[PDB]
Symmetry: D2
Subunit: 295 residues, 4 copies
């Protein structure tokens, strides 16, 4: 037999960092969950019981903490690049590092209309993520994303004109609820290395912000013909506002809210234009994906 591929590392590394402005007294926290997987000339660990090639996952964990101590952890695209570059530069036999970072929200509390200096709230489970692949001799591949952004619009979504055949029971509609959990990924142009990533650092938060804004505005304002159509419109605008983006990927469930016919009870009218009470469905759900790139 032969090893075709191999990676190993430490997953679910939770990290908190605080920043304290000794002048203002203002504190800022960052919390994330880190995964680092390494690749290289490690095959003999598997086939010959040779642990000499193994950088212990425990040591990988240590490195994460130390790197966070010595470098900024924001924006996460920079921190992930610094951490992955470390492993390939530091170990000769290690040629690729895969760094996944999930950023948790800690939003500054407003008290009495004033921003509080050291108190924070988790104002949703929405995540900001990065996947950073650092490969010896091939630079730094960064995919940024937002996930867990849960939205609903109560009208101005439609779905008619789809294929109808003998498997079809769904009725066309000109007014429905649209709810989804947004997963959006933007892939940056390859960077030659850390110097290039650092030259672009302001672009990372601004583009996350843009992506979020565009996502929210388009969902709220588009009179949606389908999930497919609306998501293309989001991807298009993002690509239009940030030239260093190569592709935008969207993955969107369609979380169904079913009308409930109550006519069997005293002729109660609860469908179509009289629809007021709906049953959210846990499963199944539609799943719509698309990757948009430059033409």
């Amino acid at each position: 037999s032969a090893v075709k591929a191999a990676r190993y590392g430490k997953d679910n590394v939770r990290v908190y960092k605080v920043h304290k402005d000794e002048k203002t007294g203002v504190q800022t926290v960052y919390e994330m969950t880190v995964c680092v997987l390494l690749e290289g000339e490690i095959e003999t660990s598997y086939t010959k019981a040779d642990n000499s090639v193994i950088v212990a996952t425990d040591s990988i964990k240590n490195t994460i903490y130390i790197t966070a101590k010595q470098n900024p952890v924001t924006p996460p695209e920079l921190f992930g690049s610094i951490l992955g570059t470390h492993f390939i530069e530091k170990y000769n036999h290690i040629h690729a590092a895969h760094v996944n970072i999930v950023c948790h929200r800690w939003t500054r509390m407003d008290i009495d209309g004033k921003p509080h200096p050291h108190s924070f709230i988790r104002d949703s489970e929405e995540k900001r993520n990065v996947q950073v692949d650092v490969v010896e001799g091939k630079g730094i591949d960064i995919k940024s994303s937002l996930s867990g952004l849960t939205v609903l619009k109560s009208t101005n979504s439609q779905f008619w004109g789809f294929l109808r055949d003998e498997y079809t029971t769904l009725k066309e509609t000109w007014d429905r609820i649209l709810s989804t959990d947004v997963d959006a990924t933007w892939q940056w142009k390859n960077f030659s290395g850390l110097q290039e990533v650092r030259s672009h650092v302001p672009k990372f938060d601004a583009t996350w912000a843009t992506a979020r804004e565009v996502t929210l505005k388009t969902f709220a304002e588009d009179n949606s013909a389908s999930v497919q159509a609306t998501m293309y419109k989001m991807a298009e605008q993002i690509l239009a506002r940030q030239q260093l983006i190569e592709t935008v990927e969207y993955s969107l469930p369609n979380k169904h809210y079913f009308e409930i016919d109550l006519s069997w009870h005293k002729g109660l009218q609860n469908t179509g234009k009289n629809a007021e009470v709906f049953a959210p469905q846990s499963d199944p759900n539609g799943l719509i994906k698309c990757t948009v790139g430059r033409s």
Copy 2:
């Protein structure tokens, strides 16, 4: 053998309701998860296979939808009271109804600084809950709560002066991180029935708001001597602002963020006043509870 106690019903009933202001065009959504458990003279269903006494849980589900269609679903204390009262009034052999409601957040989206008429976002997993017990001849017992309110303060929490003995390894501290998931319950004075509940309807949202505000303000401003001390201060203020409240209960985990000693690495200074990078602990966690009432 004998049946000492029995209840049965329908759990995990998801419900959505939309309200449409035909004048403004503004829509407002409500989403909740409902549990209804009934008690009464139903013992023979268990001992004699006599299903005649059973109101099918399927029918309970139907009733929930119909009630939501015909009545306001907000505030949830009122809706739960209406639903529980229905079952005890409608069925002779049913003498108590237990209604649990979890309200999910759907917060109106602001677009371009303007509030959007029909688009919403789940701006956290914080829940607003009610437990409503409706008992034939004993009125309506309501417990209101907020849960899943996740907060963190990065300083102005202390913990020193606790009991030290041969089981103790914890060091006293004058500056630590405090993070918790707030579970807060306020128990209303018993209501004689629906008319009384309706007479108090404005008090329910205002008190939820107050409880939330007090909870947030006190956490952010208290230089906490312990979780115990801070939570008492919250309970006290709530009781002070709403006389129809009999008791306030708080249940607060202490979600530990451990200092990481990096001194073993190039003498890196990361503890005490140099503490910048911390390891959030998933488990174990402290759990602190208290019920405060009127003196």
Copy 3:
């Protein structure tokens, strides 16, 4: 204001213990999750910022490990009794200890038809639990349970003869699927203290075994008239086989499997006696509870 009730402690304490038979070479593992909540004269921690009365939750955690090191951890009813008794005996101002233990399964692996000496498998998420309340001057209250026992029978369940009114749409049936997650609790007679608990130690595993067996046999053999009826039959037998049990409580969801009408497609026959493909429903679900005691 005044403190009406208070408890505090350490939750989610994961513990593993190994036992090694140096003669046979056979090893046996135990894994559990422990919660310990204490009550006593601790009110001033809340009202006066007085931490002197607080046994740190960190120390509670330590005590758990030490107790497990020095005592058997099986059966869990004994271990919980030892741990709770410790806190009330050791601290003067602490008058009650609440110990919750969840036991995780680690079942010995059979290899080549032979039992393996030190390898184990998690052969389900079924748990064995105990809740032990140790109260100064009132002895030791133990509730034992099994939970997460998921079963299904594909026929020999019925549900007809229930109440029908204008809220009812459910059809009577003489053949349906019955699936549930079994939660069963048996409450022991109060014990005067540890000596009495130790005198009964063999009864704890045998009764857990009996409860499980009775639960499984009755579910499989009863031609069920309803969930209510079947669960009473389980409770009754358990009470009949173990006199030191005061009450048996059962909590059983009814996890619905809905028939799917495929007649709209080429007249496909998939209901009633032709029912072959079903849609498991995630929610809502029926929830049926009962407490059976001695008559």
Copy 4:
């Protein structure tokens, strides 16, 4: 802009099927969760709001039920192949179908040492999965797997000889606990289509069985030098017993059980050879992956 890639479909489709042997009276159940994602000439749904190319996800759901009604659902490799082939054969503009199936366990109950004809138990959360990719003109690509197989061995695992540098704090050990959740995937040689898949149907359950057995036996009998080494030995044997397998992939977390030093308490000895009580760690965890193919 341009669409680079696109797929859409229905996820989280729960399906139950019962088989009844009218001769023996014996019933057999199958429960699974299905995801079907389609690809083809659908780009205009995204860019031109053209829903004519869309096979509604609702219809996909229907098709799943109908296919299960008309075909065997076991082994899942066959059922997934039948379902994916359907979509590409049935719709001209649809050129690929991606079918994911998770099979849930429903193990026949033994009562009184006798197998019960219609009662089942979920004897773990271990899953049997298939991923089936059906691509017009390129045949049928099947990946089979088991997942959620949770095991532990209490001794006969070692980890020494790894790389030590200034990031390393981990100590070498010759005796530790090894616990993991097994995720194992075997990739079949490409099949030309359904006829070929059907010719191999007996090989699918036998190979799942083999993979499981080899996995269990090797974990229990290997005196493990590392996770890497042990998993290679599993992959190798599987490849050796089934020639139609092209590659075997393993993904294995290392779920750490940390020694607890209790020496600070009355000189309690709980480490190294005296190690009896351990603290399972929820996070972080090691993550070890490898793909083994034919040499």
